[model samples]
Target: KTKEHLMLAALETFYRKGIARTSLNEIAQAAGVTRDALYWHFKNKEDLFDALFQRICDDIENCIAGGSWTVFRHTLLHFFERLQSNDIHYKFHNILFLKCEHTEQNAAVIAIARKHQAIWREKITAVLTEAVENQDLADDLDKETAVIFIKSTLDGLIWRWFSSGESFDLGKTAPRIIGIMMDNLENHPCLRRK
Candidate 1:
């Protein structure tokens, strides 16, 4: 109960104030718990920060584990409809993409982010390998580079849409945007086997 209360408070503070600017006392205050109480649930702010990332990974892992990457892609498509609608998760990404500076003060945060990214990279590559095996993707398809291309496009879009200041609807535009991207993926020469 108080655990997530603490996480949500951390999310709120981290989102509004940026992680590097925010402090443990501020998070404890936001959580309506004493500093000791906060420590009772977490080792410190770094531990708490990693905990939040773990929650996001759990959600992502569960989603991706359910079926094909294409199925996950559709789930990813509908995901935006609910992104800003209930932003428990959005603030996490917001803190990640726009709020924090990747400085040494919180270097572990980026490491954790990087760690998950490497994990996701492997899973995606494995899926693409499966695609090639099943004759779903061109046999000559560059799987590793394809992973880079896909994740790169997504990171760019997430940053842009999150920073868009209401100029574009991520939920509405994502389908066509990603669909076109996918079409280009299947047909694009730039991503040809190398």
Candidate 2:
């Protein structure tokens, strides 16, 4: 029970403070316990952060897998809500620009993040391919490329949001960006001119 509480506290602290800035003592304090107690649950800050991140990814994947395409689209777009969810975007922005001048661990963090994004890309591609085959997308559409391009742009847009350092509405912009990309390849049944 004590260990679980410590890990939970650490997760919240790490999310609010970048992994580089957060420390064992702060986590322990947040947990209402000693630093040794926090260390008892995890060997280090990175280990604890990795576990919490993995948990979030696992839960999100399970949730998306349980839903249909329409649900899945909404699920992906729901990242917008993170802007309002306990300042989650602030944490992500911090993670995005960290400078670990002497280590390769940040590469692993990026790869881990990419792996999560790839899961959604695969699912979205599958659905879009089916739609293309069924003539739901225009005849000129390249299903594979269309999926790749749109998702790539979606990624860019998110990164742009972080770069902009402003509160932007991802959901509000999705329809426009999605339409432009889909139209660039071929018209999609689910999209239309605004």
Candidate 3:
């Protein structure tokens, strides 16, 4: 419970103030705990940030763990929907992409981002490979390139939404965007290898 309080407080603070500017003292104060209590649960701000990020990764891995090409499109759609639907997911997404500056000062956070991106890419690529085998995707579809393209497009779109102060309906738009991508996977000539 203490750890949860601390994490909650940290998230609140990180969301409102940005991680680079947020301090352990602020988190402890926000959580209504002593600094020692914060230290008991986390080594430092970076450690707390990492724990927060790991939570999201765990949620994502859980969401897509059992998926195969049979549910590839739905799994992809669910991943985006989950992020948009959950408060924690939405806040962290904003914190990482908008609130926090990508800089050497936050090297640990950047490392975590890269690690999770690789994991997501690998998992998605596996499903895409299965899609090709199941005749869902074109036989000549380049899975690696498709994975990169899909991840980039999703990331770019979300970043754009965030940049626009989330003025649009992401929940409604995400599935449609992914549906188009899925259709393109089956028929887009660009997805096929030369």
Candidate 4:
């Protein structure tokens, strides 16, 4: 329970101050616990942040996993649906993309983040490949390029939405944007072979 309190406090601090600048002292203070208590649970800020990130991923995976989502479109839509509505997940996304900075000091953390990204890319590409085999996506679709484009497009859209002060309804806009992306993957000439 104390660990949970620390995790929640860390999330709040990271949301407000970002991972790079947020301190262990701030987390402990936010949790209303002594610094020693915080140290008892976490070796350092990076360790704590890693735990938080894993928890976030676990939550998102639970949301999107299970059942049959054979098509890339349905698979991705389910993912976006699960992600768009949760406030904690939303803030965590913001912190991961917008708040955290890449620096020598945080190289280890950055590497872990990159590892997760690679895994996600592989997952998406696997779905696309399956869709191609199942005749859901184009037979000539370049899987790697398609995965890159899809990931970049979604990331850019979410970043834009957040940067715009959350002016648009992400839950509504995400599906429409994803539909356009899926259409392009199906019909775009650039995604064809050389």
Better of 2 and 4 by lDDT: 4
lDDT of 4 by residue, 11-59 (tens): 8898998888888998999999999989999878877777777887787
RMSD of 4: 2.6
The true-versus-predicted C-alpha distance at residue 116 of model 4, in Å, is 1.2
Q: How accurate is candidate 3 locally (lDDT)?
A: 0.82
Best by TM-score: 1
Clashes of 4: 0
Given candidate 3, what's the lDDT at residue 35?
A: 90
Local accuracy of candidate 1 as per-residue lDDT tens digits, 1-194: 77999998998899889888888899999988899899899877777778888887677667645335476467567556556665777888878888878889978777777887887798778877876676656777877689998888778878888788657878677787788767766677777785
Number of backbone collisions per candidate, in order?
A: 0, 0, 0, 0
The C-alpha stretches of model 3 lying farther than 4 A from their native spots are: 64-67
* lDDT string, candidate 3, 1-194, tens digits: 67877887999999999988899999999999999878988988877777888888788768766336557767667767867788888888889889878778987777767787787888788788777777777788888789888888888888988899889988889878887877787788888985
Residue 46 in model 4: lDDT: 75
lDDT of 2 by residue, 61-119 (tens): 66565224345455555554553363434464345444222246445555655565677
Alpha-carbon RMSD, each predicted model:
2.1, 5.5, 2.2, 2.6
Q: Candidate 2, TM-score vs. the true structure?
A: 0.61
Please provide TM-scores, in order, for all candidate models, with all chains considered together. Answer: 0.89, 0.61, 0.88, 0.85
lDDT value for model 1: 0.78
**Residue 42 miss distance in model 2 (angstroms):** 3.0
